[PDB]
Amino acid sequence: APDEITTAWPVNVGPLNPHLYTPNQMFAQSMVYEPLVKYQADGSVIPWLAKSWTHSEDGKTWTFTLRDDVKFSNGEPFDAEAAAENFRAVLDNRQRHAWLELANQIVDVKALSKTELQITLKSAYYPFLQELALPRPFRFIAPSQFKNHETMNGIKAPIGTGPWILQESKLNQYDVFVRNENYWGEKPAIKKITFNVIPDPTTRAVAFETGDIDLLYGNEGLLPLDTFARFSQNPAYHTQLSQPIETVMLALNTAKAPTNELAVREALNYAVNKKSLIDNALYGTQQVADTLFAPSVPYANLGLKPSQYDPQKAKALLEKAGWTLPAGKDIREKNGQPLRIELSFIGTDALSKSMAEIIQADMRQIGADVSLIGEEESSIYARQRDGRFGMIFHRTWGAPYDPHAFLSSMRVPSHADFQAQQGLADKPLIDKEIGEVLATHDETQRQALYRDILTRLHDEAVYLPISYISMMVVSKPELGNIPYAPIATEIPFEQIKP
Numbered sequence: 259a260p261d262e263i264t265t266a267w268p269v270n271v272g273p274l275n276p277h278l279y280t281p282n283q284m285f286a287q288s289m290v291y292e293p294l295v296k297y298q299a300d301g302s303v304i305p306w307l308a309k310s311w312t313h314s315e316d317g318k319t320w321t322f323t324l325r326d327d328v329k330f331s332n333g334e335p336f337d338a339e340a341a342a343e344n345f346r347a348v349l350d351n352r353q354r355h356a357w358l359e360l361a362n363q364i365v366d367v368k369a370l371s372k373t374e375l376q377i378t379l380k381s382a383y384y385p386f387l388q389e390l391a392l393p394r395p396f397r398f399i400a401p402s403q404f405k406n407h408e409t410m411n412g413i414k415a416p417i418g419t420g421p422w423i424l425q426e427s428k429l430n431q432y433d434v435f436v437r438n439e440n441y442w443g444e445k446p447a448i449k450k451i452t453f454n455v456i457p458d459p460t461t462r463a464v465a466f467e468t469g470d471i472d473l474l475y476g477n478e479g480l481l482p483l484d485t486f487a488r489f490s491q492n493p494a495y496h497t498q499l500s501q502p503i504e505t506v507m508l509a510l511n512t513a514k515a516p517t518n519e520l521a522v523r524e525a526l527n528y529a530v531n532k533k534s535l536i537d538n539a540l541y542g543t544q545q546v547a548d549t550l551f552a553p554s555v556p557y558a559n560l561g562l563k564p565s566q567y568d569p570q571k572a573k574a575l576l577e578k579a580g581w582t583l584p585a586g587k588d589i590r591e592k593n594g595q596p597l598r599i600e601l602s603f604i605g606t607d608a609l610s611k612s613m614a615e616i617i618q619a620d621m622r623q624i625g626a627d628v629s630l631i632g633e634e635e636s637s638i639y640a641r642q643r644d645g646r647f648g649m650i651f652h653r654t655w656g657a658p659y660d661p662h663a664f665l666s667s668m669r670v671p672s673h674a675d676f677q678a679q680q681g682l683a684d685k686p687l688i689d690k691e692i693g694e695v696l697a698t699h700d701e702t703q704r705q706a707l708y709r710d711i712l713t714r715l716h717d718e719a720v721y722l723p724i725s726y727i728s729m730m731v732v733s734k735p736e737l738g739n740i741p742y743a744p745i746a747t748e749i750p751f752e753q754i755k756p
C-alpha cells in the first residue's frame with residue numbers, strides 16, 4: 259500500500275481522447291499519452307518518442323528519427339506509421355485546433371519508413387517543437403483504437419505509450435490509474451493512483467483531514483487558502499507552494515462603453531491595491547502582478563511601468579476624461595451617464611466572488627460602479643467568446659504556452675483576448691505582428707516584435723493584472739517531497755518517490 263495513492267480532482271479525467279478537449283483533463287491525457295519531444299524547465303525540448311531530428315535550410319521540412327523500442331500499453335508497436343496516422347486524425351479535425359498555430363502550419367505528415375517521420379510546414383514556425391510537446395493534441399493513441407480510422411468522433415480504449423494506464427472510470431465518483439509495467443522509460447515508484455471526484459474546495463480539504471485522500475495538487479483554487487495556511491503549520495501534514503506559474507488578470511473590453519475609453523482603463527489599473535486584495539482574499543499566498551506576463555517570462559522582461567495603487571491618480575484620470583461626481587452621488591457621470599461597468603465571473607466559485615467583491619469595492623472608492631454578474635461556467639465562457647462583458651476574470655496558461663501560444667491565440671476571434679482587444683485602433687497591427695513573431699528566426703526582430711506587442715497591450719491598458727499564482731500541494735508526509743512539472747498543466751506523478 260505505500261506505493262498506492264489516493265488523490266482528488268474536481269471532475270473525472272474524461273474519456274482520454276488524446277485529440278480532444280473538455281471533458282478531457284490535460285494532466286490525465288499527459289499521464290497516458292506521450293509527445294515526440296518533451297518540454298524541459300529551461301524552455302528546451304529533449305528527445306522523447308523521437309530520438310533525433312533534422313530540418314531543411316528553409317526551416318519548413320522536419321524529419322524525426324523515432325525510437326524503435328516503444329510499444330503501446332496493449333502491446334502494439336509505436337512507429338512512424340502510427341505517429342503519422344495520429345497526425346492525420348488530429349488534422350482531420352483541423353478547425354477545432356485553430357487556437358494552436360501549429361495545427362494551421364502543418365502541411366503534410368508522412369511516414370518515410372518505420373523510424374522516419376517527415377513533417378512539412380507552411381512557414382519556418384519557431385515554436386514547432388514546443389507545440390509538439392504540449393499535452394494535446396499532438397500525442398499518440400494506438401491506431402487500432404481509432405473509430406472508423408478517426409479520433410474526432412471518439413476512440414475505443416485510451417491506449418497510449420505513457421507511464422500510466424487508465425484502469426477504470428466511474429462517472430462522478432473516481433478514476434483509477436495503474437503504472438504501465440511495460441513502459442519504455444523509467445518505472446514509476448507509485449503503482450496505483452485513485453482520483454476521487456470532489457468538486458468543492460472545502461470538501462477536498464475535509465477529505466484530506468479525514469484521511470480519505472493522501473494528496474491534493476492544484477492551483478490557487480485547490481482548497482480554501484485560509485485552510486491551506488493552517489495546514490502548513492500542522493505538523494501532521496506536508497504542504498508546498500511553488501514559485502508562480504501564470505497570471506490571473508481582468509480583461510477589459512476596449513469595444514464596449516465605458517471601458518472603450520483609454521482613460522477609464524488606465525484609471526481602473528490604478529484603483530486596486532493588489533497586495534491588499536491578495537492578503538484579504540487569497541490569504542497572502544500569491545504574488546502581486548503589474549504586467550500581463552511576469553518579468554521572468556521569456557521575452558517579457560521589458561521594463562514596463564507598473565501602475566502602482568494610487569486612487570488619487572485614478573480619480574484625476576477620470577476627472578480629466580469628463581467623468582465627474584454629481585451632487586451628492588458617489589458614482590461619476592459623463593453627460594448624465596453613470597460610470598458603470600459589469601464584471602462577470604463564475605457565480606459558484608467562492609474565491610472568484612470574493613475577488614470580484616474587492617474589485618467592486620476598490621473601484622467604488624474612485625467613483626466607478628462595478629456591477630457583479632455571477633453566472634454558471636458555460637455562460638461565462640459564452641461571454642468570453644462573444645465579447646459580452648465589460649470586465650471578465652481571465653488567466654494566462656503557464657509554461658510552455660506563455661507568452662507565444664497565449665499571444666498566438668489573441669488572433670482567434672472566439673477567445674476573450676481578441677474580444678477585449680477588438681476596439682483598439684492598433685488591433686490589426688498587433689495581430690499582424692503576432693503572426694510575424696511566430697515565424698521569425700532573426701532573434702533581434704523576434705525580441706522587437708514581442709516588445710512591441712506587449713508594450714502596446716500594456717500601454718493600452720487592455721488588462722488589469724492581479725496576481726502571479728502558484729501551484730500548491732497538501733500531502734501525507736510519507737509521500738515525501740512532491741515535484742512540479744515543467745508544463746504548468748501537468749502533474750508529475752511518475753516523479754513521486756516516497
Ligand SMILES: O=C(O)CN(CCN(CC(=O)O)Cc1ccccc1O)Cc1ccccc1O
Nearest residue numbers: 279280284357394395654655656659673674747
Ligand atoms: O485546451 C488546451 O489544450 C489548452 N487551452 C488552449 C485553448 N483552449 C482550447 C480548448 O480548450 O478548446 C480554449 C481556451 C481559451 C481561453 C482560455 C482557456 C482555454 O482553455 C489553453 C489552456 C492552457 C493551459 C491551461 C488551461 C487551458 O485552457
Ligand SMILES: [O-][O-]
Nearest residue numbers: 279280283284
Ligand atoms: O483547456 O482547459
Ligand SMILES: [Fe+3]
Nearest residue numbers: 279280284357
Ligand atoms: Fe483550453
